[model samples]
Target: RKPSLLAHPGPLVKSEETVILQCWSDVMFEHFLLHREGMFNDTLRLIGEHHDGVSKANFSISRMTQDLAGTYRCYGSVTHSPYQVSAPSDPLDIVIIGLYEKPSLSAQPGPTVLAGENVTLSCSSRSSYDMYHLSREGEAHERRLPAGPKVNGTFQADFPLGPATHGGTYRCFGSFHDSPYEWSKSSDPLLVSVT
Candidate 1:
């Protein structure tokens, strides 16, 4: 049977963080291989078994880069035979969080407001950004705002919502129009209280 592959924090990882990918099988194996996305060859690199165990191979990436983010799979092989290679483990997608300054979110009128009143959420940053995103606490998805407007030496986006539909916390993220996937750290959450 094929070995099982696992990545610590498999899907999402922060920049400069360490990532560990492991291959495990019930039976002992002499060698293991690591394969990355888009590579024609299944085995991009021959990773020797972790000396401590023959049933597993542990691959470690000390520092992560945007280029290293992708799907990865692993295989194991025993010493004595052909077709000894284990079946490829399921692929794991690694998403890297790039470096960006966190933005700030604020509510116009006040944090505490009467129900049915309108409110404007302003997401701003000292560093510049061409695009912005707002994530409401209870919403299942994120809202992407249009290109930012320059205001007070900073880039900004104004999000207006009416009738104050109950109340919830909100946060924002900033990014460039060209790199929508590379987002800034989320802004501090702003809570709105309906009276």
Candidate 2:
């Protein structure tokens, strides 16, 4: 069978969300990236893939939102498998709502805390899905750890600190879940340090 791929509401908005990109391949590419238009082909486009290549599973862009809008292209294949990268999947016509209008994520009164001082970081969004601290943000990636289900409507966690938890650029993910498992968009960088 021929490899299949498709996305709906090509040029979409956050209001009409949960568009699915159904991809079925007789030869499934273990890894792939849903790069925005001109992402690889056009030097001017530098928005890294909205969807990181899916591995061992199916992926979808169900939660179609405004800010996530762009010219999307799917590129995939197994890594280190010695197969040339397949031709581009197709360009996704998307519209990330409030594209230029988004709230900034930040933490205040941050510091090197005493052994037991409590610290709190707040996440707010101007977009739809709502904000929650799903997991501790890593130095490089906010969603470094897998995302967790919402407990009590929002995903959150408290940190009991000590020197052992020291030395890092901490952050959190601001996710807008318009669909069941689809993640709409992430927030700008937030930094916090504990000693």
Candidate 3:
């Protein structure tokens, strides 16, 4: 069976922040291996420790860098069967934030809107980012859009949301295509009050 990998403090972390990745499995294993996506030669190996009847390994990053931002998976292997390892753990993406300047987020047609009305949220930056991402407070999924045509010396993407059924705070981030895991600082929160 595959192990479970979890990042402490969640996945999105700021530059220079500490990150701890915990890989745990119910089955007993002698060692744990951590592998970063697309880096075949750089696998981190660790001796498995037992805690509360579970075997696990803790991989710590003292300071986050742009290079460390990527997806990761882990595996477990027993001492007797060194050549055999358990199935890979579910992928976990470690995104590094604050790598660049924050983009400006604005809501068109005002911030307050009636329920079931459509609103346009724009994320714009002067940094020429190739991508923009809008995240709603308490939402697990983020909306991403490629950079739209430059307007007024800024690159922006408009995210059309709702039937504004549920309203909350929203923020946007900017990033380039080459550095998918690295993101700019989050824009100031924009509140969407729906009546």
Candidate 4:
């Protein structure tokens, strides 16, 4: 059976807190491995292990650091049968805050937008960031864009809101492309009214 991985308290963690990842499978296994996405040859140190009805392994990091924020996955294998390896679990994206200043978000054409008119949302940062994220109100996920041919010393991106966009809030963030999960704090919300 394929192994399963679950993150405790979700993937977004503070620098002062701990993030625990638990790997489990119905089939019993003797060895487990935790790997961070990228870094082809490096594996995270295992923090704990469990061997009850279901084979389990726990990996935790206390006092998270900016460098620790990234995507992670785990695998299980049998010691006796080295050739037998379980499929890797789902990827878990972890974000650590306090690494960079949040990007400022702004909407063009004023906040009181009229229906059938499009508004462009722009996010900018003074710090050197490789990417920018734009999020609309009620959106669980943010859209990531490259910090391109930079103008001046700041990085920026333009997110477009279509005419169908309804009244709500919006925000933006900045981060390095290598550590996309390590997003800067969200910018102050920009409220929009469409009528």
| Model 3: lDDT of residue 28 | 81
How do the residues 64-101 of candidate 3 rate in per-residue lDDT, one tens digit apiece? 87667788889999888878899999887788888899
* Candidate 1 backbone clash number: 0
TM-score of each: 0.53, 0.32, 0.77, 0.62
What are the per-residue Cα lDDT tens digits for candidate 1 across 116-185?
8899888898888888778777554467786466767888888887777678898887877665445677
Q: Which candidate number maximizes lDDT? A: 3
> Each candidate's lDDT (Cα)?
0.72, 0.42, 0.87, 0.73
How displaced is residue 27 in candidate 1, in Å?
32
For candidate 1, the 10 contiguous residues with the lowest summed lDDT are 38-47
Listing every candidate in turn, what is its Cα RMSD in Å to the true structure after a full C-alpha superposition?
8.0, 12.5, 3.2, 5.1
What is candidate 4's lDDT per residue for 93-193, written digit by digit as tens?
66776567878888787778779788888888888788887766655456778876678887788887878358888877788867667778888989888
What clash pairs does model 2 have?
A: 10-93, 18-62, 32-53, 37-71, 66-96, 66-97, 67-96, 67-97, 69-96
Which pairs clash (backbone N, Cα, C closer than 3 Å) in model 4? Answer: none
Clashing pairs in 1: none
Query: How many angstroms is residue 97 displaced in model 2 relative to the true structure, after the best TM-score fit?
Result: 8.8
- Number of clashes in every candidate structure? 0, 9, 0, 0
